[PDB]
Input
Amino acid sequence: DDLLQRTGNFISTSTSLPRGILKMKNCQHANAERPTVARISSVQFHPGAQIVMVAGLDNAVSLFQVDGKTNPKIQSIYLERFPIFKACFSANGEEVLATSTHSKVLYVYDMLAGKLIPVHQVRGLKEKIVRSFEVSPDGSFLLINGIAGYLHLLAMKTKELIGSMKINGRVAASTFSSDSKKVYASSGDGEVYVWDVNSRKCLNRFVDEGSLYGLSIATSRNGQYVACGSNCGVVNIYNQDSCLQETNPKPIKAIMNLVTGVTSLTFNPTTEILAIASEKMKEAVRLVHLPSCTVFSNFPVIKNKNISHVHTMDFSPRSGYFALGNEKGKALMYRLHHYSDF
Amino acid sequence: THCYKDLGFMDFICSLVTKSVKVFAEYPGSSAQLRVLLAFYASTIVSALVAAEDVSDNIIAKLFPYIQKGLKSSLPDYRAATYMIICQISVKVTMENTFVNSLASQIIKTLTKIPSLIKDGLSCLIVLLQRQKPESLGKKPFPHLCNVPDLITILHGISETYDVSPLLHYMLPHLVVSIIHHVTGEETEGMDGQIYKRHLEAILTKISLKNNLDHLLASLLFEEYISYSSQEEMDSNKVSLLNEQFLPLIRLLESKYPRTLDVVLEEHLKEIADLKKQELFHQFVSLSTSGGKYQFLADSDTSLMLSLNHPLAPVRILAMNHLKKIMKTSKEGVDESFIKEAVLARLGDDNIDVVLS
Amino acid sequence: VGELVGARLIAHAGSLLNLAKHAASTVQILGAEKALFRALKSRRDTPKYGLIYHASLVGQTSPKHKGKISRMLAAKTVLAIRYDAFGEDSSSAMGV
Amino acid sequence: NELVQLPLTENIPAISELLHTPAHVLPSAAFLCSMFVNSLLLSK
Amino acid sequence: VKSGSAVHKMIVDRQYMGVSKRKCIVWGVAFLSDGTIISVDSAGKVQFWDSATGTLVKSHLIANADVQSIAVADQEDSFVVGTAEG
Amino acid sequence: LSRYRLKFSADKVDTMIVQAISLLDDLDKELNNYIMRCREWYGWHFPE
Amino acid sequence: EGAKSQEDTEAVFKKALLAVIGADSVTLKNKYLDWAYRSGGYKKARAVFKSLQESRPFSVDFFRKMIQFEKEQESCNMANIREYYERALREFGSADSDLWMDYMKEELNHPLGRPENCGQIYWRAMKMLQGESAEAFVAKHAMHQTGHL
Amino acid sequence: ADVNPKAYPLADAHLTKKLLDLVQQSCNYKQLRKGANEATKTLNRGISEFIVMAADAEPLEIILHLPLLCEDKNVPYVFVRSKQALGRACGVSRPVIACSVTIKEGSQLKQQIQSIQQSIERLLV
Output
């Protein structure tokens, strides 16, 4: 009835993530137990366990227990002459897949069975080297970027080729849809193609606004947003329905904060944060509040001068942790106080 | 900037506005004299709330008595300025459930004093019920909310252009409970329960329900009917009264939105089969025109729709046999169409005994 | 810009199409030819008003802001000059 | 699932223009309340 | 034709699912009613394209040398190709 | 035949804009000279 | 008009505009526009107004009459209402305080008007008005803010 | 489709990629003038290699004075479908409707500029 005949509060916390200011605290480095000086190519959080995997230009692949204080080492594996271009977990999380720069063989590490299977020969595949690849969220498909604008679809369980898709021009980047029923491929002339997984047909061809050539592409888990990065540092965010039906879609908001070409795009699992990065400049990483399409003003503390060049970003499955990998061999980790679960 | 950073200036402005309003209240037909000043009072404070990076509890604690004074006044412009201030505060800051409850209570209780500011006030409530936590508001202001003249007509007028979903989302769970309480018991008046059922009927007929309010209403009706039918006392006469009260509502909810009742019945089959509540489910589906196609079989815990086309062939015979009994008896929960396509589809399958049935 | 100022602008260039070929900066300093060449030879500061000084918008503004308004008016004015010279439909929709 | 961005005061141009005018030029508070509350509502 | 503008330009890979310095020469093109383009390339392959989207539909590698001739019957259920091998 | 064509491309000619702004200045000069004589000649009769 | 055909009335008006060229043409144009609405409809008035919109000797009654005709018609296109006011303010905006005040009340009272434009109209009114007319508009607006109007 | 016919030298998809790539190089070597007003001064000074214009300027007439000046100086001019693409190629965070590549002695873009000039004039047959 009245709040000034008693003593009490007026301001309370919201369930949704607040805009403008992000509450964060620095944590211990992910690769603290295993220090290195080589560039960190990939960092990723395990889907079902508190495990973080760090791979880099040094030939080692490591798995770490995710603890804020110490981050103890679980296991580290060194390959002979295999500088890891990209390493990722499977959708189920049971096996680890890694690839190298200018190497034909693809390494599959099955943790449950304790077997390391090198897939050097894929039948029906004419590709000389395998460096760029993506995995579907459902876990039934694997996509390999090739040459002459070729996309190769492989079964996950047996690693055998299903079919091929050819686009005009070079393949710059590719990603899978949230439902895993479609493929988004960005070409080298700024055009983006949409392919159907079940029948390898081109559903639609739309054009990213003001893009000479694209470098990255990402999709949200809920299926609402599609993000495309270009050479000028401009990231365009679209509705997924707009991309499917319009040849010249109008983006919801074009992020002009980054000034150098965007190479990394990562969506928050709750679809409230978009992380953008450029490796050509130091301190070139930003965070975007998705519903408002506004950038948090407090994340990059440029005086500390720790982030430097950014090559890989990842979020914990419940968005409790944020990971960052640089060229100095430091896998930086931050905790977001808004999310209390790993 | 000096208004939001320095609280003394804001207190000065509010005190000046209140004193000027109190001075000019005595003279009849002096509302125009307070125009510009009140506009100034509307112009700055909202803008101040826009300018502040974070609105601390001090600002809201200072603003609240003046908000209450604006709500209690009879001047239209002063109430309008209070409404704008309340709207901006609700948009910007998150509030505890108690303070939202008190603010909504004060908005609802003083709505009818000025008849020219009803609509905006209701719309203001919608904003307060859209930017806050869903269960912030309680049940205490519900009667005074129902007693305002021509509530559903104003709600429909607002609905033609803007979304009115939060107010109905708040209203319906209370409306069903209050209707059941009127059916079995006493209220403030019999016309109170009558105006409750009239409100729910008018909401069903005139205002289109969107954002899955249909599923919520159907689930509330089914769940609470089953819950009251599960009371320790028999109340057979009260049960019949409740049935004749809910019959037209179920009729119209089926008619306007066809498939919602089927889905909500499908979602609730499992726990009804788990418990010994098959007879109550049969009574509820008999209350509807369609939904008797989900009648449980006499011997097993399966629905009639699933019994007709599930893989196991022998027990399917009983289903058609049950349909035959449903054929001969007084069909009340089932319709002609379902029986027709069921028999037409079952004439042509593999099993010869099924063909004979 | 007005009836009188527009008429003087056309007369200076000799025709409407000749005025259309000019840039936005030239239209601003079209009237002030004596100050322009005196400043250019002596390496002094260039004039900023020209014939636009007698425009209605420039006249109303305070003397401190008469410099900013002159270039904003001149940049927008040439857009009306090009469309009136080359467009085949006579209307005031864009100018308003 | 679906994320919807509710309207905000600073984004609306009409509300900003109404708030940038001098107070004596400004119209009565009832009209301002009508426009403000209508703009704050979600349009369907 | 009722325009004279090139709606689609289709890039042909110089080697079958690969790249080479030698330029690929399209020796013959056949056009069907459904909208599919049949092309024969110097890399030794016959390619089926879709005109509506301007993307490759299928490829067939049939020879180690040039495939140089294309011909389709009046009823579009059969066609013939010739290779440099004879 | 010629005058049928370029007539339809007329009313977009500015020869009367450059001939009516120059005349507008000339009339101002003659007005200034003529008023001065009127005030001067009649100022010897009613100077106030 | 009383005892002759419609076409002859228009012929007399056109002869009158040719004979009278100076300030006396002001009353001629006003009666010509009034006749067009009576003899014809709104469409006839629109044709006459378009022909006479460029004959510079005018009065404020010419534009006020045309605004009233648009108001009586069921359409009430607000773009045309603004379009007539801009032409009137171009001719007599420097000295007519009432015309500026009448324009501002249209944006408030009319259902299709935009009240948020009143900030720009007041700003434009001060600069174009000269001398005592500027002071008159302030006093009239100050009375309009109160109920005295 | 849906292009104003007054932009006759319309480059196709392949030529547009070559055009914007060259414009990007010219920005890096400080050989590009940005804006319709700055472009116009280059033709009057006769130091322009070629002119690139944006076809989707909603009033297209505001840039139609440039083709007339080009035809006197014998300077090739071409239209592109997007001003947003033209603005990003020029390295500006705002749309650009006209840009000019200027004459520079000793430029390493001379072979590329010559090739594009042969391409643009080839459109006019």
Notes: The radius of gyration of chain C is 14 Å. Chains C and D do not touch (no CB pair under 8 Å).
